[model samples]
Target: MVLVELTYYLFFIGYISMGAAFIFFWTERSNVKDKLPLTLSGLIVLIAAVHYYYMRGEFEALATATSFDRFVAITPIRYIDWILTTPLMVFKFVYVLKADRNWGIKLMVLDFLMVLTGLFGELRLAEMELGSVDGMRVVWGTLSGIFYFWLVYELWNKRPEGIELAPVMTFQAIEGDEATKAYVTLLRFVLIGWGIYPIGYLIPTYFAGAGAADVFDWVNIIYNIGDFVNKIGFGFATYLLVKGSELE
Candidate 1:
């Protein structure tokens, strides 16, 4: 458990560093344009901090104390944290479509699904019913999986004929850098990491919630680990996207 926690903490540190570098590289001179990425990434980091502080336990305990009287600081942190990071699925799709506008139809469909997935996830969390939360997360996981597979299909099937890798690394891919093709290829692998969460979490969570006599002894631990992995896998995606040509 100690090793697991330590590993996640290190991943969190990496997320912070990558987010900072992304902001520094992509920030525009215009104030309004600069706030979106800054605010989004900042809220993500803040949420991570809150998780570290409050999610030490498992099951209902996670949200048990998160009530109105004590929410002066908590509610804003929770809402901002989730809202900011939620667009990441759309962000990735935006990047790929920028490279291949011909896929406008596919992109739009995926974006709609991403919105539904995010909405369902937010609803699940609100229920505060651990089993239902995990079940609805399948919706989020499935959408993400579809997005990942689509990217892999394009990078292979579509042959991205002229994409560049160099421009991608320097944050100039939007203008067309055929140099960053390799990194773009790696994006699919990053998606696989996200897929692992659903595979490992969904079934165990269902069984744990089945009211099996032995369920209580281990359900909380399993669920907490699942939630942790879901976030961390996303942080990996975010870190990779930071290296994009446009940075943010």
Candidate 2:
């Protein structure tokens, strides 16, 4: 009970702080030529806060005698949050790198597949027909993992028979150490910051006992923390690169 209450506070803080970063990014948009990153950044936090708004209510609503049934009600809400924001989050890199539009499309498709397959498993979409209650997740999560790992490769891996950490090569040379470092920094954010999600997904499925409210509490807390670092913390990192470049 006490742990569940802590989840409420975490989501509340995420809602307020992401809203705060949204305002900052939007108002600061005036200072840059490459303004779309700020626009993307602003929207990332704005949409996240909007989703967090719903998550908070859903948590409280499920916190009743129905608390045991919380996962049934709550999993879809978190998936929506990931679906809406993750593409937007990844696109900030594409825009910053001045990468291809197909990269944007590619990343969005990967993110969408990742969450959709995850939903099928977590929501137990074909449970009765699929036979075992949990076996479906193994199939779905494996399929989902392919997309997730593909996304990570696209963001960070050197291409086959080629070498470079990013697509827009002149960026580091144009802006010198700052943009180069910023580019690597953003890559790591996507690399490491985004991985928190898969770990969160594993917890309730693999770690928790039946009807474990305590596991739910920790999962949501990790989700909330992941959002803060990726959204608000991401915006600040973007600010560093863009603002510094704007300085001439």
Candidate 3:
């Protein structure tokens, strides 16, 4: 009954809005560029939709007398999300690799590591029925944290030499123009902000107990905040990519 609340409705609205915006920017014919960002944005939309549907169930189970089964039922959804998002995450890295081809070899190695780590976690979770088993979440969490940290490091450190963001007052600009440069620079900060969440992800993974759960709860809240910020940034950047204009 509570599943039809105003908050849920609003979430659906925003979710669809962002997804539609991504498709719009992606399909636009004018500014044909790298597919990595668009691909990553699309994956974000998919993840958001999955999350919404899972949360709708959580609300529905709230009124049930024997609702404990809801957690078990929802466990596969989390596993599915991780299994799906694990590789789709590579699109973002592919974008970075495109920007810096020299780093591709090392990056691909990390990608394989993630594949092994994520798949192993999936197997472990399946064997344990997604219950709170020892070292399972921590193993998965650490692998995920390491992968995300690599991305954050690349965003912050891998910019080409002499490509700093500059003002557009003077019309004389390089190949891509000042707006493009500024957008790339903006993207770096946005990515860095998004990356901070994973840095703390390892703490709970390494220290598994009651205190770790509390730490994870805080990390979950922070992760949600980071996701919101990331979506806003992605939405704005996609619009800019579509328009080939200054970022909003």
The candidate maximizing lDDT is 2
> Residue-wise lDDT of candidate 2 within 150-228, one digit each (tens)?
9877766533232254543323432345546565666667667877878877765565554454665787788789889
lDDT of 3 at 247: 66
Higher-scoring candidate on TM-score, 2 or 3 = 2
Kindly list the per-residue Cα lDDT of model 3 for residues 165-197, writing each as its tens digit. 352223334456544454354445345654555
The best candidate by TM-score is 2
Model 3, position 83, has a per-residue lDDT of 47
Q: What is the C-alpha lDDT of each candidate?
A: 0.43, 0.74, 0.49
| TM-score between candidate 3 and the true structure | 0.53
TM-score, each model? 0.42, 0.83, 0.53
Total backbone collisions, model 2: 0
Clashes of 3: 0
Off by over 4 Å in 2: 66-68, 125-133, 158-179, 210-213
